Design a protein around this ligand. Sequence first.
Ligand SMILES: *[C@@H]1O[C@H](CO[C@H]2O[C@@H](C)[C@@H](O)[C@@H](O)[C@@H]2O)[C@@H](O[C@@H]2O[C@H](CO)[C@@H](O[C@@H]3O[C@H](CO[C@H]4O[C@H](CO)[C@@H](O)[C@H](O)[C@@H]4O)[C@@H](O)[C@H](O[C@H]4O[C@H](CO)[C@@H](O)[C@H](O)[C@@H]4O)[C@@H]3O)[C@H](O)[C@H]2NC(C)=O)[C@H](O)[C@H]1NC(C)=O
Ligand SMILES: *[C@@H]1O[C@H](CO)[C@@H](O[C@@H]2O[C@H](CO)[C@@H](O[C@@H]3O[C@H](CO)[C@@H](O)[C@H](O[C@H]4O[C@H](CO)[C@@H](O)[C@H](O)[C@@H]4O)[C@@H]3O)[C@H](O)[C@H]2NC(C)=O)[C@H](O)[C@H]1NC(C)=O
Ligand SMILES: *[C@@H]1O[C@H](CO)[C@@H](O[C@@H]2O[C@H](CO)[C@@H](O[C@@H]3O[C@H](CO)[C@@H](O)[C@H](O[C@H]4O[C@H](CO)[C@@H](O)[C@H](O)[C@@H]4O)[C@@H]3O)[C@H](O)[C@H]2NC(C)=O)[C@H](O)[C@H]1NC(C)=O
Lengths: 162, 54
Amino acid sequence: SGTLEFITEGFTWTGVTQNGGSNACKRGPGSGFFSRLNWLTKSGSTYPVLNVTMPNNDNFDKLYIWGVHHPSTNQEQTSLYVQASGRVTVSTRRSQQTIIPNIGSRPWVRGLSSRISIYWTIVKPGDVLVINSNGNLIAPRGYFKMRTGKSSIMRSDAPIDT
Amino acid sequence: PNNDNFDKLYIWGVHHPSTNQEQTSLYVQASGRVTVSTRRSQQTIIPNIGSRPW
Ligand SMILES: *[C@@H]1O[C@H](CO[C@H]2O[C@@H](C)[C@@H](O)[C@@H](O)[C@@H]2O)[C@@H](O[C@@H]2O[C@H](CO)[C@@H](O[C@@H]3O[C@H](CO[C@H]4O[C@H](CO)[C@@H](O)[C@H](O)[C@@H]4O)[C@@H](O)[C@H](O[C@H]4O[C@H](CO)[C@@H](O)[C@H](O)[C@@H]4O)[C@@H]3O)[C@H](O)[C@H]2NC(C)=O)[C@H](O)[C@H]1NC(C)=O
Ligand SMILES: *[C@@H]1O[C@H](CO)[C@@H](O[C@@H]2O[C@H](CO)[C@@H](O[C@@H]3O[C@H](CO)[C@@H](O)[C@H](O[C@H]4O[C@H](CO)[C@@H](O)[C@H](O)[C@@H]4O)[C@@H]3O)[C@H](O)[C@H]2NC(C)=O)[C@H](O)[C@H]1NC(C)=O
Ligand SMILES: *[C@@H]1O[C@H](CO)[C@@H](O[C@@H]2O[C@H](CO)[C@@H](O[C@@H]3O[C@H](CO)[C@@H](O)[C@H](O[C@H]4O[C@H](CO)[C@@H](O)[C@H](O)[C@@H]4O)[C@@H]3O)[C@H](O)[C@H]2NC(C)=O)[C@H](O)[C@H]1NC(C)=O
C-alpha cells in the first residue's frame, strides 16, 4: 500500500465504554492503547449485543484493522464483558469472519498473560462493512486508505545517508 | 461405495439460515451438523445461523 494514512470514522458504540487503556501500553505517564484501536468494555451491568454498519461509498478500497481480546481468566472475561463466552463477527457482502475468543493463559509477555488477535478486512466500493459482537471486540476507529503501486518493505540495519 | 475404476467428484453444500426460527422450522434441532468422510479424510461443518447482507 505504501501508506499509513488513517481516516477516522463515526462508529457509534452504545451502552459500552470506549477508549479503555492498559498498563502494558502507555502514552505519556498514564495508561494508553493502540492509537488506531478502540478497546470497548461494559457499561453498568450490561454489555449489549452490538450490530453496526459502515458503508463504503467512496471510489477506493478500505482496509479495516480490528482485534479480538483473549482474557487469561473467566473472571476477567465476565468482569469486563458480562457474558462468559464472547463472540465477534465481521461480514461484508463478499465474505465473513467469526472469531470466538480463547480464555486461559499463554506464557507471560509485558506483564500480561492475556492477548489480542489482529484481523483485517478489505471493503470494496459499493460494499458495506458490518460488525456484530456480544463481547471481546477491539474495534476500528476508521480505516487506512489502500493504494496500488511500487511501494515495499526491506529488512536492513544499514545507516541511511543523504 | 465407489466400485468403479475412476475417481468420483461429489459436490455438496451446507445451509445457513438467517434465523433460529428458520433453522428450527426447517430442520427441527436448533443446531445442525454435516459430516462427510472417506477412508482417507473427513470434513465436518456446523452451519452459521444469522444474517449476512442481502
Ligand atoms: C491523517 O490524514 C487524514 C486525511 O487528511 C490527509 O491525509 C494526510 C496524510 C495529508 O495527505 C493531507 O493533505 C490530507 O488532507 C486526516 O483526516 C483529516 O482530519 C481533519 C481534522 O479532523 C478533517 O478536517 C475536517 O474536515 C471536515 C470535512 O472535510 C470534507 O473534505 C475533506 C477533505 O477532502 C473530506 O475528507 C471529508 O470527507 C469532507 O468531505 C470539515 O467539516 C471540518 O471542519 C469542522 O471541524 C473543524 C475542526 O477540526 C472546525 O474548525 C470547523 O468549524 C468545522 O466544525 C474539518 O476541517 C479532515 O476531514 C480529514 N481529512 C480527510 C481526508 O479525511 C487525519 O487527521 C490525519 N491523521 C492524523 C492523526 O494526523
Ligand atoms: C499452567 O502452568 C503455567 C506455568 O507454571 C502457569 O503460567 C505461569 O504463571 C506463572 C505465575 O503463576 C508465571 O510466572 C510469572 O513470572 C513473573 C516474571 O518474573 C512473575 O513476576 C510472576 O509472579 C507474580 O505473581 C506472583 C504471585 O503472587 C508473585 O510471587 C511475584 O512476585 C509476581 O508478583 C509470575 O510468577 C509464568 O510466566 C507462567 N508460565 C509461563 C510458561 O509463562 C499457569 O498459571 C498454569 N495454569 C493453570 C491452569 O494452573
Ligand atoms: C444488523 O444490521 C443489519 C443492517 O442494519 C441488518 O441487516 C439488514 O436488514 C435490512 C432489513 O431489516 C436489510 O435491508 C433490506 O433491503 C431490502 C432491499 O430494498 C428491502 O427490500 C428489505 O425490506 C423489506 O422488509 C421491510 C420490513 O418489513 C420492508 O419495509 C421493505 O419494504 C421490504 O419488504 C430490507 O429492509 C439490509 O440489507 C440488511 N443489511 C445489510 C448490510 O445488507 C440486521 O438485521 C441486523 N441484525 C440484528 C441482529 O439486528
